[PDB]
Each structure stands twice: as C-alpha cells, then as structure tokens.
Symmetry: C4
Subunit: 452 residues, 4 copies
C-alpha cells in the first residue's frame, strides 16, 4: 500500500471504449448516442462513468504544434463532447501514444507531452489512455520506459486539471513495479480477444510469461488472467493492474465464459471497461455487466486483488488443447472473503475447497479457520433474459431493476447489507467440512463468504 | 500502420544480391553481366530492380577518411556501375556495417556515418544494406542498437538523396519494434541457408526464440519463418520484416521446398531478393522466381503480412527429426484472402481448413463466413520446365511469356483482373464445407480466395 | 574472498525482527519487553544481538526533511530505545526502503539518503535493513540497482558511525555479484513463509530461477534454499547471502521441518534472525533456536557457505507435488566438514553418502579420502521439551543450560573442544565404507566430520 | 575475419598456469623451477611459451598507488622473474581483475588501469589474464562490460609494450561479440574442473545456455564445450574463445577423457594452457600434452574453429545421467579437414559419418564430395607410457622424441609434410562410402582428412 499518486483511482475505473467493436470508425454522434444509451440502460449509475474515445480521432497537428481533431468526425471540437458528457454526469476520456504515432498512424505525443496534455486539459478531459506504439526505441529496461511515461504524467500534472492516467504499455519492462507512482492503471498484457483459451501466434507469450518481450495481441482471456496472477501484490488503492477492456457482448463467447471473464476481471481489481456495442448488446451480456453483486467485489473499498490459491491442468481439454482448473481467494474490506472456483476444462466438473484452502494465510486454530462461514452465490438474482431484452428493447426502464450506485455507493450498500450486493445465501461452510459444487465448462462458481 | 519514414518501401523491395553464391569474389563485370542477364530474362521488369553489391568491395580508406573501392574489382569507381544500372532502369545497392569492420573484415561505418553516407550518395546509390558486425559492444538493449542504426539513417537523410535503408542486425534487441521509424526493412534473424528444416549449431535459437541473443547463421528456412510468425503485426507500408535473401536456385532444395520457401517469403511481405547465380540458374528455380501470381501477393498495395492460424507437430519427421504442419491466412487489398497450407512433414499428406479458420478474426454469421468464396491456385500456369530452359538457354525471349510489371503495375493487373496474377480457379468454398487438398512433403498449397 | 567493505559482518548477523508475527503492530514496549525476554531466555548471549525494528515506525517527515518517529508507538524517540538496548548489551536495527515509500506506505529514503542516514546515526543505530519497495523504476540492470544501494551505503559511511548494512532487494539484478563491496548482507529472494515446499502464485519463480524478475513473496523454505544453492560462491567474510528471517516458531511447521530449515540456513551462512514471537514461543522451536552445535556452524570463523553436492527428485511427493532429496557438504575452519542429508520427500527414507561424495573437490588417494573421519550428530544433546517449557514458563533459568557465547566465543569453544559445540560422536566413516541413516519426511541428518 | 587488434594472437596462445593445482600457494622458486621443468621436458619448444602467474602474488599497494609484489613469495620483484624467463626464451604472464579486488581478495585494477598497466610494463610482462571479480556492478549489458575491459586494453596500449591481453569475464554479457576489437582471447564460461560430464550446482547454466547470467565454476568439460559450440563463428586470427586451462594431468580423468578434452580444446582453437603440476605429471597426461599432431590443429595458420555438425543424446548414460554423442568438422589452412567423432556416452560404441556430413557446407557434386580423401589418425605415434615415464623421470631427454616447433614452425612442418604432424594414414574415404570406427566411452576418434 501507498497513497494514490494523484488522489484518483481509489477503486478501479469503470466505463466504455469504442475500440473492441467500432475500431477507427468513430464520430461525435456515435459517442454521444452511446453515452445516452449507457445512461438510459442504467449502466452509468452503476459506475460506468468513463466514456473513452480511442484511436483515429485527430486529423493532424495545427500551426502551433497543438493537436487537431478530425472535424469530419468531430465538427464541434472535443470540449463540446466533454460538456455533453459532463451535463449527463459522465466523465470524458481520450487516447494518445507515448510514441511518434498512435497505433493507427495518427499524431503521437512523444517529446510533445506538455502541448498534448494542455490540449486535453483545454478540452476538459478527465481520463487519458496512453499507448505504446512507435516509441522510437525508448523501451527495453524499466528505467527508460518509466521516464517516457513519467513525461506525460508530469505534463498532465502541470495543467492543474485532475486526469485519470491510464498506461497502455502492455506490461513492457515490468510495469507493475513502477506504475503506481506515476499512474492510476497500467495494461499488463497485449490486447484481449473474444477467445477464452485459444493460443495465438500474435500473442507469443504464454500464461506463465508475465515478463514478456513481445506482448502482442489477440491474447485469450485465460492467457491474460494467467499473466496477471502474480501481479496482484503490486496493485492497490490508486494504482491497478489493467487486464484490458471487457469482451462481454463482443464476439462469440458462451454465457459461462462471459460470467467467468467478468467475475475474474472484477476479483483481481481490473478496470471494468465495456468493450461491447451497447446499441447491439444481447440480453445475457447486458445482465452480466449489470450484476451489482460482482461489481461490488471490484469496487471494494481499500481494494485488494485476489490470490490464485491453486492451479491444475486437466485431461478435459478443448479444441485448442487447453484445460486447467483454478481456485482464487481474496480478502474483502468488511471482513468477508471472495472465492472463485474456475473451471477452464472442456467439460462440466465437480470442484471443491476447504476453509484451510480459502484462508490460505491463516494458521491452524485461528479464528477464520475455526469459525463457520455463510456462503453467498454472487451470481444469484441476476436480471433474467426476458427482463434484460425488454430493457434493451426500450419496453422497460432499468430504474428499480438495476442497483443505483449514484444513489447509494457500493460501500454504503455493503454497510446496509443490501441482498442486492451480496447475492443469495446458499448455505454455510464449517471447519473440517468441504465446499463442493458443479462448475460448467469454461465457467465459474463465484462466492462471497461472511462470518456466521 | 504509420507513414513510411522516408517515403520508400511502400511495398517490399525486390532484386538480387551476390552473396549467396559469389561471396567475396566480385567485380564490375560480374555485377554488370548479371544485371544484363536479369534484365534479359525479364526478371527486372517483374520488379527485381535492386542490384545489391555485398561485402568485400572496398580496399581501404583514403586520405580524407572517405571510402575507397578496390580498383582491381572496380576500376571505374562505383558511380560508373550506378550509371550503367540506371541506364538499364535498375537501382543500385551497396553494403556496409554499423561497426568497425564489415563481416569480411573491410572498413566499417561506425562513428564514420556522414562520410560513408555521402560517399554512397556521391556514387549515386539507391539502397544500403547495413550490417551488424564488429559493433564495439553497442548492442544489448533496444535503445543502444536503435541509436547506432539511427546514426546512418540520419546520415543518409542529410545527403538529400533518396536511399532505401535496409537494416541487417538479425533482429537483435527486438528490431521489429523500432525499425519502422528509421528504416525501410530489417533482418529479423541470422542468415538463411539452403536447408528447409535442418537445425544447426551455428543457429542456436530455435523457431520459438524470436528474442534471440545469438542470432548466428545457417538457420533453416522453417527456423526463420517460425521466428517471423509473431512479427507480422509490426510490419507494414514503409517498414518490412526481412527474412533474408531467397535460397531458390541455391544449394539442393527440392522443387516443393523452393515453392514453399518462395510463397511464404511473399505471403509475410518479406523482401524478395534473388540469392541464386542467375548465370547458372536451373529451369524449375527460374519459373518459381517468375511466378507473377505469387509476386502479386508480396507486392500487394497497403501490404499486410499473413497470420499463422495454426501449427501442429506431426510424427512424419525428416532425417533431422523435424516435422510440423502450418496454416496461414492473410487479408488482401482488394478484399481477397491469401491461404497457405504448409506441409513441413516428411510425407505427402491431406490438409484441410474451413472458412471459420481462414477468416480467423470474423464472427459467426458475418458476411465473410456466410458468403461463398472462389478458390484460386496461385501456382497454376507456371512457366514449364521446357519453356524456362529455352529462355535460360537464350533460345526464347521472356517477352510475351513473363508478366511485365513495368508495363502494368501489379495493382493495375489486379484491378483489370489478369488471370496472370490470380492463378487458376479450381473451385469454390461454401459455409459449413471443408477445403481439402493433398500437400507434398516439404510443400505448400497456396491459394487466393475471392468472393463469389 | 575480499575484506569486509566496512569491517563488520565477519560472521553472519544474528538477532530478531518483529515482522513475521507483529507486522505493522509495533511499540516501544513490545520492542523492549521482547528484548528483555530474548536476554532472559539466554538467546542474546548465544549471539542473537540485533534487535531489528521493521516497517510502520515513522509518522511522516518533519520540517527539516528529517524522519519523525510515530510518537504514539515511540513516545521517547528512537535513541531512547537504542540506549535501553545498549544498556542490556543489545544492538539496535532500523528499517527503510530504497524508494519513495516503504512497503507499508511510510516515508522512504530514495534521494534522501544523507538525511535519513544521519537520522539513524543521531538515534544511535547499529543496523539498517534497507528494502526495495517503490523504487521509481531504478532497477532492471545490475548497475542501476548497485548505485541506488551504494547511495545509502555511502550515506551511512559519511555519518562516521559503524552500521551493519543489510540489503533487502530480494536478489533483484543479481545482487550476489555486487553486494559485498557496499553491504554486509543481501536478501537473495522474495519473503519466506511458514511453508516447507508449497509453491505459491505470489512467488512465481521456482527453485531453479535464481535470476528472478518478479521475486514476489510467500516463497517456501525449499524454494529459497534452492535459489541460494549456486550463490554460496559469492558469499564470505563481510558479505553474506540472506535467505530471510527464520520461520522457526512461526506458523505450523513440523519439528523436522524446523530443524531442516534452521540447519540449512546455518550451513549456507545465512543471517540467523528470529521471526518468532518470543513471548509466545513453543518449546520445540525454542530448543532449535538454542542449538549451540548448529549456531557454531553458522558462526564459523572465515566462514564458507556449504555446497549442494547432489539433488534428485523422488516419487514420494507431498500434497503439493513436491519431493526432492539433497546432500550438502562444506569445509569448516578447523579442518572439519559439515554434511547435510536433506529429505524433502513426503516419506521417511534411508539416505547414504561416501567420503568421495563428501569431499567433492578431493582427488582419489588424497589425505581426506584416505583418512578415517569421526561422525558427530549436531542435533544430539538438544534441550528437551520439558526443560525448554520450564525455561519459557520462567520456572528455570537458561544459565548453565544454554551455551554462553558472550562468555566464550564459538571459535574458542571449538579450540577447547566443547562437546557442547560438536554434538555427539555416533561413529566413524572409513574409505570405501558408506555413511547411512534414516532421515524423516521433510527432515535432515546434520553431521560434523572430524579427522580421526 | 578482421585483423588482430594489436598484432598478437595470430594463433591461440600456449603455456602454463599455476592455479589448477597450486592455487594461492606460489613463489619465485615454484615459478622458475616449473619454467625450467617445462623447458627440460621439451614442452616449451612445442609452443608452451607463456608462464602465467595467477592470483595471490601482491601484498598490497605502495605509497604511489602502484602495485607491490609480496616479497616473501617474490623477494627480487617481478621483472627479475621476467628476465629469467626471457633468458630461457619464455614469455611472462601476470594476473589482475577488472574490479576492486582479485578473486582471492588482493588489490584489483578497476579505476586504476594505467598505474597497473604501467606496473606490468615496467616489470617486462608479455601477457595479462584479466579477471571479473568484485566489479562494482559494472556488468549486465554488453556495453558496460565492454568499456570496463576496454579501459585496461587502452591502458596496456599506452605503455607502448606489446601485451597479450586475455579476458577472464566468463562470457558475461556476450563477450564473443565484443572481445576481438580490444583483446586477444576471452573466457567464455565459468571455470573448468576435472569432470567430463558432471553437472554441478556451482555451475547452474547447462550446455545450451551460452548466454549465462551466473557463469559460476566447477563446470564440466562437456558443459564448456557445449557452451562454446555456437561461438566458433566469432573467433579467428587475433581473437579466440577461451575454454579455460587444460585439466589434463589434474584430478582423476581417464586417458580417453583426457584425449577427448585435449583434442576438442585444440579443434575449437582454444588457448592450450597446462593446468597440471609439471613436477608431478603422469606419463599418459604428458604424452597427450606433447601430441604434435593435435597441437598442429590448434596452431593452424589462419585458424578457423571447428563446427559441431550433429549431437544426439544416447541411453548409455553415466553415474550423472549424462550421455551424448557428437560430430565436429572443420576446415584446415592447407585444404585438409579435421573430423572428430566424440562419444560422451558411458559405453564403447560404433560411430559413423559420411563425406556429405563431413563437408557440411558443400553442395552435391562439388569437388570435396566427389573426391576421395585419405584418413589420418591424429592420435597415432603418440609417445608411449614407457618413454614418457623415462623422460619425466629424467632418464631420457625429450630432444629427438618430441617435435620442436622452435626449430620448425608447425606451418613449415605441414608444408614439408612431416608424418610427425599428420599422424598415421589408416585408410581412405570415398563418395557414397561410410567412415566407421569404434569410439571408447568418454573418448574420441580424431582425424585429419587429406585429398587423394
Ligand atoms: O489502435 C489503437 C489500439 O492501441 C493499442 O494497441 C496495441 C496494438 O496496436 C496495433 O493493433 C492494431 C489492431 O487492432 O493494428 C493496427 C496497426 O497496424 C491498428 O489498427 C490497431 O491498433 C498493433 O498492430 C499491435 O502490434 C499492437 O499490439 C491498444 O492496446 C488498443 O486497445 C487500441 O486502443
Ligand atoms: O559478409 C557479408 C555478410 O554479412 C552479414 O553477416 C552475418 C554473418 O557474417 C559472418 O559470416 C560470414 C561472413 O563472410 O559469412 C559466410 C557464410 O557464408 C562465412 O564465410 C563468414 O563467416 C560472421 O562470421 C557470422 O557470425 C555472421 O552470422 C549478412 O547478414 C550476410 O547476409 C552477408 O551480407
Ligand atoms: O582466484 C583466481 C581465479 O580467478 C577466477 O575465478 C573466478 C572464481 O573465483 C573464486 O573462486 C575461488 C576458488 O578457486 O574461491 C576462493 C575465494 O572465494 C578464491 O581463492 C578462488 O578464486 C570465486 O569463489 C568464484 O565464485 C569465482 O567464479 C578465474 O576464473 C580463475 O581461472 C582463477 O584465475
Ligand atoms: O513492510 C515491510 C516488509 O517489506 C518487505 O517486503 C516485501 C513485500 O512487500 C509487500 O508486501 C506487504 C509488506 O510486506 O505485505 C502486505 C501484503 O501485500 C502489504 O501491506 C505490503 O505491501 C509487497 O506487496 C510484496 O510484493 C513484497 O514481496 C520485506 O521483505 C519484509 O520482511 C517486510 O520487512
Ligand atoms: C456471434 O455469432 C452469433 C451466431 O451464433 C451471432 O448471432 C452474433 O451476431 C449477432 O447476431 C444477431 C442476430 O440475432 C444480430 O442482431 C446482431 O447484430 C449480431 N451482432 C453483430 C455484432 O453483428 C455474433 N455475436 C457478435 C457479438 O458478433
Ligand atoms: C588421482 O587418483 C589417482 C588414482 O586413481 C592417483 O594416482 C593420482 O594421484 C597422483 O598419483 C601419482 C602416481 O600415480 C603420484 O605421483 C602423485 O603424487 C599423485 N598426485 C597427487 C596430487 O597426490 C590422482 N591424480 C591427481 C592429479 O591428483
Ligand atoms: C500534481 O501533483 C501533486 C503531487 O506532487 C498532487 O498532489 C496534485 O494533486 C497533482 N495535481 C494534478 C492536477 O494532477
Ligand atoms: C517435542 O515436541 C515436538 C512438538 O512441537 C515433537 O514433535 C517432538 O517430537 C518432541 N520431542 C521429542 C524428543 O519427542
Ligand atoms: C598408459 O597408461 C594409462 C594410465 O593412466 C592408460 O590409460 C593407457 O591405457 C596406457 N597406454 C597404453 C598404450 O596401454
């Protein structure tokens, strides 16, 4: 633990990014309509405050060296978009790269940090995603990468405007070590894709290679989670490990895969950023994004990422030869404990654990191991497929259905003991007893344990 | 994507180099005769414009510190060779090393970049191959290697002469990351040899070791292709991965090995540089170099290297214990798709793929997966062994037989739909159907798919 | 061998640290009571001189930039604690980090080395544990880490006060190479835990990965010993490999595990620092800490760490799939030899060795291989469970029971031949004969061999 | 190839070092007696010119900062020893470390390069072995190690005295790349030991790990040879890979192991430095050192290290689980070829090769593959055990028995075709025929092939 370097990111950020679906194809209308839609679906009031505009937004640089927004896509300027967003209680996020160009080939900020930082402040920006493309060889050791990213960190501070600073260097040069003191969140891997396990030649580093020299992209959900496992210890209040935007609602993942993906991202205190097209979001995906129970885990005050307790490879492998089972446990602020039984195998299986395994750093005969604990299924009481369809199809309102965090912070709700945030009690676990369930293929059992 | 740093290399370079056969043994006559021969065989007009003179060309340095060409080998100077080449519509390329000496022990350019750059400009040079021998410990991190190669990059720019800058550092210190902003192409491995699979003690890094600390040489064709697989994502217009000169016509590769080698080099957008002795070139090798269909893939406008979709090891291993099968797919500018089924096994085998595998980043129900595609064998209509022999034996002319890119750029030919550039339609692939062929040992099936 | 850079640490340091049990929860009273208790139990006079106060002791920094001790925990200041300790013949140790903050988030010493060094001298400090948290990207190569730690090394020297300088960078950037010239001891791994073999996701580097890029913590006893194995050759008089505080009396290790852990730590010349709560220490653990025989090995004059002679994996694996057997041998100053037969297997087993294996660098027919050697069980004559309980329960005094090193240095005792420091002779080993024993699961046979 | 940076080391150096047997225990008498003995046994006139004094020779530094020789060991100074050596036609070599201290703890030369260099010149030194102990963190990248060793390289040059500069950094930071331009030879691994295959915990890097981060020591003969295999390509006239002093006559290697060890060291163009006590040298070891045939390979003009053609692991493993077979081939200056069939297996076995395998870089139908070659056993006509005993026991003189290179350089002898230097013709190898022999366990078949 250390204080937030800039007072922001006391919990992981939440919001939305246009990349995963719209890529370069962007506009003022797309952004604002989507913003409205996110607000209308009640996701904004769940915490999804950040509207993040990605790459391909500028047209070039003007006479003063300052950045110029592509007026075809943005005919009123950027600050105009910020204002619309602020008026609807959103926060506004923009994109750049710590290099000559951005990953799509547009002007980059390397050596031009102050001008660009000021441009973002001038256009009333709250959040900067800062990439790693075309960095002119300014990487390869922790020090050199640290200074390149400190440049913009300092540049933003100089503008006097509070800006949530999001590093996007894919974990290059061991970012988990040096991120906290200059940033609020750092990407720790190459880009995620809508694949749960699939290895990819574009993502050469496997799950064990947290110190990757070619981060790449099209990395699977399990590849990134596996890379993040040891990094939890270097995350905390004010500085988080970023496992990339959520793929829930994107591509062709199963409901089980989407739950597992969303739960784990929340349990390791990763930024929860919607990658889906909210105007073309399916019901099952929508109810996953809106699971207040799980969001509460991610938004835990004085957040601590969960720890992977064990991992075994299984003979039940998928079409890609992948198959492993995992257990994760983690402390919660109010004395509770998160537990995940993760079945990455190709077949439905029984999974089990004990109190000894759950409270991994507790000695024999200690309170936690000698007490009885109530088990809450965090996935219970999820918005059903019919209700979600109705809300998405504008027939119903989200009001009264989805938990409102604007009305009542997650911390408050936990203090008040909202069944809304704790899921449903399905039983209890006692010393010398075993917790057992059936966990679907590529699925999860996700519990919150409370003392009896 | 980013713009070409110097406006050159909008497609991968094509041409010829004396090293693979003649090594140090060089002369004005060898160069000029070969140039004429390349022109006469019609290869020049296919795109093979660059005549690259390699090592062992200088005799020392003169009183002014400037380089001096070995007058026994070059009695008229270098600019005299340039002129002959320009007159015959060739472009002229020379060699140096970012070190104290060249790999053969001749004067090197380290710390003497401006003088040497100017010398090349003064002798009207269009292309520089810039090696990595005797670099005085100026390597080991990306930064230090970047600055060493930037030195000459800057030095060439200062001369005001357009020069195609070809890096030859064998991928040391992760060149794929930093090459684009200062160069047009970069060697990404140690030297190739006329072996398809053979591991070599002089090339200690295997196919998976793209981050190699001892690049070495005598690396097999499959060793280099395997190293290049993840690097595709860091190549594009103006900056290419260089998998070293072609070994087609050199050594004792089979026809199938030569086709596979040539196709893959083209599909990953590698420089296509003839390493063969064109005055002693055999028929089968000649027809491979002259396959307009395959060159069109390499010379695709807005070029994107193909992606390796899958790779499996097989029990059919050769004399060296090597045996793997690969599938590669890649987007083409006009909406087409390149597909390669690569049999690196020791035995002829059936190979298969689907549309789902071919369009690897396409969601279910999307156009590409729901449409029907016509399959074109890119190796059809190749110059036969009799015709090629006749052309090489001067009995026939290449004119009217080989596609003339000078007369009609590859892009135009693709727009005009020249059967010359598309191969022969052998069928079509529909959703839920499987594409199946028989692929020879160490051979390839190489397709272009067009929408129906 | 090289002289001690500062004249201290001629043998490995011994003492106690509050972290392993009390963590942040500390006070003047806790420290002083514990000090008294350590003295009363006779451990002080065995060599456990250093009372090391860990993290969470400061409240902030004062107006002059100097450090300020948290007056709630320390209402008389630090020098007041030093004095009480000096008066009772203890030495006083404090904590800081070569970073912006300490690992618990309190003021760190990076860039503020002189002020902080002076503060420690002013408060009459004898020992500094200097951590690696929040180091602002000042790591990644040996050189950069070396200078960061040299900064404080120099800063302490400037104060003119003798200070035992203990590095705590977890072996990052190959500390064993550069530690000796600027420090007395260096942590060579991430934090130990009360687990003998258990792999942990928070400690990603296994036993073979001595060059670890994410040191982590919760590393098992065998994980750290395995990492230390090759490092012996870079330790000696004045500069030692530090395998972290002893876990004897902490958590739930078996008696056999505690003996193995304690013996090995001693045999490799690691600092012997009590991590146990001495006010809640159990009998068996107490008798282990008080084994004069084993301490004599650690405190050997002109100390040389032992060498691991062999290591095999066995099918007798524990609940964590871990199971290996090891033999270690090491020269002693008086011509004797330490031998350890280490059974990390899950089952009791016979273990054997010869003189050829014991004297691993001795040629055939040399004196050591041709002589006969007496075998001394170093674990014989250990304080029994009844006597220790009595001493801990204040019924008996340690005086007359525990060896007094203050009264008679270990070297003297070895010269005088105290059966107290040599254990019990259990037999002899002759050329061509085999030394065989039964070694318990997770246990050790620990011998001193003397010439007949 | 590149010229020798200083004109020395046109062939690998030959001589003797006191370390392998006498370690720190040294004197003027030991050195001079040994020198006389080496001369009397006729080894000096075989090329063993360099008498290298190792560590533990100085007593401290004098008032001027200059080095002071330990007058108990050297009561006449060092130049006095040089003179005795020059008078007997020897060359004199001394030791230092690019660090604060030497490996035994005596004054080191880091930051004091000029004074020390001048001290060596003043005492008429011809050769410097320059170690890597206590280097104050000045390693970790190629550049930093390069400059540290360039310091002394420059310092020696400044003295104007020709000095053979021998690097001893154990291959740290890829020395094979940067050694040539500043040195004559570089250690490429940790210290050798009298073990043929034995893995050792003090030498953690295996045979494949040429890029070692903890070089260590007590590395086996096969461990070092395996590390050196890829490095041949970076050695040549003026700059050689050093595989450490010869262990022939030291410890308890078999005659077959000693032959294999000596042959391979010669074939890869390593320095041939006697590590044995020449006053206690056994017959079989003596005849190995004196095999003119094999020395001629090492001392080949325009020397090129041999290439390992293939390597397979065998089921015939020794007590340490080690067992591999190797074939090495290499070009010789006069057009001949060295061939080694190396049996690292535990059992005697038949080994075979063809001309295609021997001439690994020759195409089918080329002269070398189509010609017939005469096979010469390089180990034939070796001094027998009786004659060697007599010479060592002073009964006979070496004169007329051992080849005299002082009288006739190896190059001359090869030109004159001395059966003395070629071994005995045992047959011939023709195209499509197989060369087969029986090779002993841990033994070698070592051939020179000549065209018929
Ligand atoms: O472009 C915005 C992108 O930046 C970050 O990217 C990492 C990724 O960038 C490139 O990927 C893409 C494919 O999505 O490839 C082309 C450029 O050739 C671009 O259209 C696009 O960015 C590189 O090709 C990859 O090497 C690199 O891994 C960021 O992580 C993304 O979220 C996104 O914001
Ligand atoms: O010399 C021209 C050569 O430079 C580059 O070199 C890498 C390669 O150089 C040396 O190998 C040599 C140089 O003459 O190449 C032949 C092999 O056919 C050998 O006779 C000789 O050793 C170094 O010795 C090697 O370590 C190194 O791998 C460039 O990459 C080549 O394309 C070529 O232009
Ligand atoms: O001492 C001369 C030695 O220097 C080089 O060795 C590296 C090696 O040195 C140390 O080994 C020895 C044992 O031989 O250990 C003691 C004290 O530690 C010394 O007397 C002696 O040098 C280190 O312990 C090792 O870690 C280190 O690797 C050189 O390589 C040798 O050839 C020789 O010249
Ligand atoms: O706080 C003093 C501590 O510093 C060293 O620890 C390394 C260890 O620090 C961090 O862990 C901490 C502190 O131990 O433990 C909890 C749980 O994470 C946090 O409050 C705090 O950050 C890092 O998280 C770990 O990655 C790192 O390994 C030292 O080694 C200890 O002996 C102790 O003095
Ligand atoms: C994944 O593939 C499924 C087929 O199993 C397909 O249904 C999804 O595409 C969506 O189909 C919907 C038809 O009910 C359509 O209304 C929706 O717009 C479409 N989504 C997109 C992005 O084209 C596929 N899912 C996704 C997210 O692509
Ligand atoms: C290795 O062990 C052999 C027995 O296998 C032994 O003979 C060697 O010792 C040497 O023996 C010589 C007579 O054969 C004797 O003259 C010599 O003094 C002796 N060397 C030493 C150091 O004692 C052993 N060889 C070595 C080199 O130690
Ligand atoms: C600027 O930096 C200081 C810390 O030096 C911090 O307290 C402050 O909040 C930062 N301000 C902004 C606007 O980022
Ligand atoms: C003393 O107690 C320990 C338990 O901590 C036990 O394991 C050990 O065997 C006892 N000692 C003896 C000699 O039995
Ligand atoms: C010479 O003696 C050695 C003993 O070490 C033995 O290996 C070898 O076989 C002997 N030579 C002959 C020719 O018998």
């Amino acid at each position: 633990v250390s204080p937030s370097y800039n007072g922001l990111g006391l919990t992981p950020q939440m919001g939305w990014d246009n990349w995963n679906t719209f890529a370069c194809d962007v506009s003022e209308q797309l952004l604002l309509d989507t913003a409205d839609r996110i607000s209308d679906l009640g996701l904004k009031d769940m915490g999804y405050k950040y509207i993040i505009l990605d790459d391909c937004w500028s047209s070039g640089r003007d006479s003063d060296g300052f950045l110029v927004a592509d007026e075809q896509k943005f005919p009123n300027g950027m600050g105009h978009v910020a204002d619309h967003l602020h008026n609807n209680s959103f926060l506004f996020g923009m994109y750049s790269s710590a290099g000559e160009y951005t990953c799509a080939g547009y002007p980059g900020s390397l050596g031009r940090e102050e001008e660009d930082a000021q441009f973002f402040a001038n256009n009333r920006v709250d959040y900067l995603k800062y990439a790693n493309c075309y960095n002119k060889g300014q990487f390869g050791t922790p020090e050199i990468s640290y200074h390149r990213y400190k440049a913009m960190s300092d540049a933003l501070n100089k503008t006097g405007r509070p800006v949530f600073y999001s590093l996007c260097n894919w974990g290059q040069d061991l970012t988990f070590y040096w991120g906290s003191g200059i940033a609020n969140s750092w990407r720790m891997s190459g880009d995620v894709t809508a694949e749960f396990t699939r290895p990819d030649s574009r993502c050469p580093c496997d799950g064990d290679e947290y110190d990757c020299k070619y981060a790449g992209f099209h990395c699977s959900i399990m590849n990134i989670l596996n890379k993040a496992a040891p990094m939890g210890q270097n995350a905390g209040v004010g500085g988080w490990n970023d496992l990339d935007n959520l793929e829930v609602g994107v591509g062709n993942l199963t409901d089980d895969e989407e739950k597992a993906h969303f739960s784990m991202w929340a349990m390791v205190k990763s930024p929860l950023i919607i990658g889906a097209n909210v105007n073309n979001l399916k019901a099952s995906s929508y109810s996953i994004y809106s699971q207040a129970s799980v969001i509460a885990i991610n938004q835990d005050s004085n957040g601590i990422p969960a720890t992977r307790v064990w991992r075994y490879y299984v003979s039940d492998t998928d079409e890609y030869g992948q198959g492993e089972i995992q257990m994760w446990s983690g402390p919660l602020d109010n004395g509770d404990q998160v537990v995940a039984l993760l079945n990455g195998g190709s077949v439905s299986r029984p999974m089990n654990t004990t109190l000894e395994e759950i409270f991994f750093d507790s000695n024999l005969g200690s309170k936690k191991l000698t007490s009885t604990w109530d088990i809450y299924d965090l996935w219970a009481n999820r918005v059903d497929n019919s209700t979600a369809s109705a809300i998405l199809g504008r027939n119903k309102t989200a009001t009264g259905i989805l938990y409102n965090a604007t009305e009542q912070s997650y911390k408050d709700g936990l203090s008040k003991n909202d069944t809304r945030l704790f899921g449903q009690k399905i039983g209890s676990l006692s010393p010398n007893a075993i917790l057992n369930t059936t966990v679907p293929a590529h699925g999860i059992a996700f519990y919150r344990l409370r003392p009896s």
